[PDB]
Design an enzyme around this catalytic site. Sequence first.
Site, PDB file in Angstrom:
ATOM      1  N   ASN C   9      -6.283  -0.956  -3.810  1.00 27.02           N
ATOM      2  CA  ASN C   9      -4.948  -0.739  -3.261  1.00 27.02           C
ATOM      3  C   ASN C   9      -4.917  -0.542  -1.753  1.00 27.02           C
ATOM      4  OD1 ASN C   9      -1.913   0.193  -4.107  1.00 27.02           O
ATOM      5  ND2 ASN C   9      -2.679   1.343  -2.332  1.00 27.02           N
ATOM      6  N   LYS C  44      -0.427   2.478   3.898  1.00 27.38           N
ATOM      7  CA  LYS C  44       0.533   2.775   2.843  1.00 27.38           C
ATOM      8  C   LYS C  44       1.690   3.442   3.609  1.00 27.38           C
ATOM      9  CE  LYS C  44      -0.352   1.679  -0.382  1.00 27.38           C
ATOM     10  NZ  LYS C  44      -0.403   0.298  -0.928  1.00 27.38           N
ATOM     11  N   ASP C 231      -2.386   5.191  -5.494  1.00 26.72           N
ATOM     12  CA  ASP C 231      -2.099   4.639  -6.820  1.00 26.72           C
ATOM     13  C   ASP C 231      -3.175   4.876  -7.890  1.00 26.72           C
ATOM     14  OD1 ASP C 231       0.455   2.478  -6.523  1.00 26.72           O
ATOM     15  OD2 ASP C 231      -0.573   2.966  -4.659  1.00 26.72           O
TER      16      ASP C 231
END
Lengths: 262, 262, 262, 262
Positions: C9, C44, C231
Amino acid sequence: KFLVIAGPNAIESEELLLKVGEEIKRLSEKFKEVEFVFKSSFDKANRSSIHSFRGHGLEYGVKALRKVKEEFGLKITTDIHESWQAEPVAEVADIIQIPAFLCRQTDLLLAAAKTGRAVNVKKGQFLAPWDTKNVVEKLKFGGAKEIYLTERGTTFGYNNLVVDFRSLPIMKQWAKVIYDATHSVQLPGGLGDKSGGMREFIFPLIRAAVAVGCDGVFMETHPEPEKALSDAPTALPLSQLEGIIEAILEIREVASKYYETI
Amino acid sequence: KFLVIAGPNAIESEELLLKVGEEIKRLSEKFKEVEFVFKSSFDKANRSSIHSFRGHGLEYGVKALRKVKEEFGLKITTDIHESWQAEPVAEVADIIQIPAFLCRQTDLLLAAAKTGRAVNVKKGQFLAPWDTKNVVEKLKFGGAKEIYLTERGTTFGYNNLVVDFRSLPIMKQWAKVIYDATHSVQLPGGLGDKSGGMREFIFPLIRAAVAVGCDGVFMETHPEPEKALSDAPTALPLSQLEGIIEAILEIREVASKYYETI
Amino acid sequence: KFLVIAGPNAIESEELLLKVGEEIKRLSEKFKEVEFVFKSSFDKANRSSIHSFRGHGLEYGVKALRKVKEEFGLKITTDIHESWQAEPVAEVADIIQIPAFLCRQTDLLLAAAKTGRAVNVKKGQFLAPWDTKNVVEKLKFGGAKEIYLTERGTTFGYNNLVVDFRSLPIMKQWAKVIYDATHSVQLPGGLGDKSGGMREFIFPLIRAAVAVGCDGVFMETHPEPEKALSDAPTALPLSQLEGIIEAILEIREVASKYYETI
Amino acid sequence: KFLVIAGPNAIESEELLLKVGEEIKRLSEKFKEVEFVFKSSFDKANRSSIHSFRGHGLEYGVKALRKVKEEFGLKITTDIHESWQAEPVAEVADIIQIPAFLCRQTDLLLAAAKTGRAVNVKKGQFLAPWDTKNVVEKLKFGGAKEIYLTERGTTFGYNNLVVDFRSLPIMKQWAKVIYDATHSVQLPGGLGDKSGGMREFIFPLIRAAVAVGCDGVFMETHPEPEKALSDAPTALPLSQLEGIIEAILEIREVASKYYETI
């Protein structure tokens, strides 16, 4: 006049009905401008768990409702689940209520509308506002004259309901509208084998319902909700009932000036 | 001191802003107990179609908003879409608005808070009420002292939004709450390459909001809603603002005593 | 050839990227009939909490991704969050990914399209399948030739997403379609300041996606899923990739015959 | 032994059940590894409009069904709407079907279970996957041994349904799961007086169901769907039934080696 449907969720005992009918009666005298109606189900035919309290049967129930209607002189309302209960129940029920899940069961609607009594249909959690129009048409066909539609929340994701207040004015186009303040805040199956709820939101949404405009409010009460045999987390205390009633009347006075035409 | 945020959706021209501002100025003088904030976007950065109106640029927009502030003494608010816009916008904006789709973009929130101006975040259509707590925390981290959370509906199926009024008391726990009366009834992408809405529901849902309890309402307006270059089906006729404001104040007056303490 | 977009991720470290790239390279050598694309976010930018891991910056990330591409000869994809990032990112990214919350931000799409690179847009959790046509229109207008639309779930009540597989054939009318197997089963802000997820549903839904018909699958993986800095409740153990890729190839092989044309 | 429940929506005419039962018979002969069950309602007890087709009575139905069973030697299934219908219907129906709206009606479930026959409950559009566990418990408490749960969509906004395929592996924990390919794509009240639907998504969603993993599929068919007296926009052409069945068998054969273990 404005309608207020109150009483314990289920007929746990005629003793309970009388205790509640007592308070309602008092309130019936204090607010002569409001039309009160005692409400209580003789059977919870749709509990999630087979192990949950349901009731003591139609016979016992109808009897208890009579006692309340005779001793306090209050109108009565209760719900039926199968076509055959209309006629017998219509002997004491001034208003026959049609359960939410059953709002589309044609035969149940016609049977209720054949007793000549008034019918209040709970809007299904799966139905759109404009879809209640056909529900009324069925009742009109069945001979009903006094018809009500009750907003009680719509399926919003899993185990959650949301109240789309746009429904109030939409449904008002073809029937008197009632707002169910207790079931609208419940969380379906939120407790595994039971349906939880968030009481902290009952009053706030009631104020919203009246500001928007409805013909009446529906709210279940109980001396000790914590000890209720059905919908404990949503049952409203009896001691708070009066205050809330005064609130909706006040708000209704100021807002009525702004309600849109039918 | 109730907050009323109003203005034309977009800065169609400096001329349109002065016309709406003249009215908002009139309202601010008539309703001295209300705090008015003039709103208008210098850019519609999230239109559905590449062919729709966006705006005349930041420089032009900031200039037009400063004219309104200078000419009418009104507070100003406008939204930003990328971090670099916060500083220049802060020169004129009393409140920096964060778009709904961007309520989770950390850098945008931080840039807005860094300006020293108050910040109002449109709650995303995908966000749960309790999820806003982290939003407020980011803003405080960024240095913001005056923070607002705006309810503008939640995603309900496709091309539709519902207003879960339970969000007002929930979000009030960490910030002041505003109800967006115009976007909450808009129908996302409902008109193909543009969005839609239902103006008939604007007023009734606003009544609901003040009855429930909020710190202010956000309402977009236009002299000729039909001709608005963005969000046309939702713009409120400029002449209808007064009546709406009067109603909210009357309802708020009677409902305010029932407002549950956080 | 079928597209398999995979990787950790977030770019937690270049060590992590290289360890994952090694397995993707091995998979690339084993499944010659598949076009693999290595994915990892250099930032992110939309975490729920200001306390969550974001990344080590765009420069560090582009370099870490270039390392993957040079050492393993793998194509690269990563997401951008503001217009200015497109150009530098385009230096290494074969496919520029547009975040779900930002799928309507015109300037971000146009900037990505301007680079000459392929563009993959994550369908917003608030967007209807038919509303993605306008997204494709902006990109084409901006000069994009290779366009992808990724299914990653739609808002269903609070803190939950549902995959409407009807979206696959609908979006295929205007773009190549990718099924995001990891984010589609995540639970928005489920664990407070972090998103939850249900890994047990990842594989079953991937099977559904390929049976219905899509052009590729996006799936995140990590050597130790539970330790992922982002995540966590959704990354697939690296050792599981092989078995899953084999299954999609086998299911596709038998179902492609039934895929509806145009 | 994959279960395939097919047939006309309602018992419109004897000639209908014969033309379909004949094809279903031929198919049952061609696919010996599949267990076919003939289905058709003797009454549409929940149509939207009081003016829509309902049926020709329980007698005319139980009779017409027995004709299908005796003439073609095919198992039968039909749904009941009220308790009393349990006993009589069970004299021809191998599997008693519980309507979606009634999946919570305790007495109806208990009645179908007492007959000793197999019971198939359509999952309510308002029910969450895990809520079905209590449904099964009720039926077992009533004496049911062969219990099925059927996925037929969930309320997604107004007049629309979505199929959350996570439900298949979830309900498989306590019962056999069937996928209703026709009602899942129907649009509740989509056409005002009647429901709508999108037949173009029937096959694709069927492929998904089998790829995910289920014990059978429910498909409504008609020689000329457009002329159907109920669910006209969702009924599958009879002539297509063969191609569909073959396709699912091929997909099942390959996907089954990946089904998770309950």
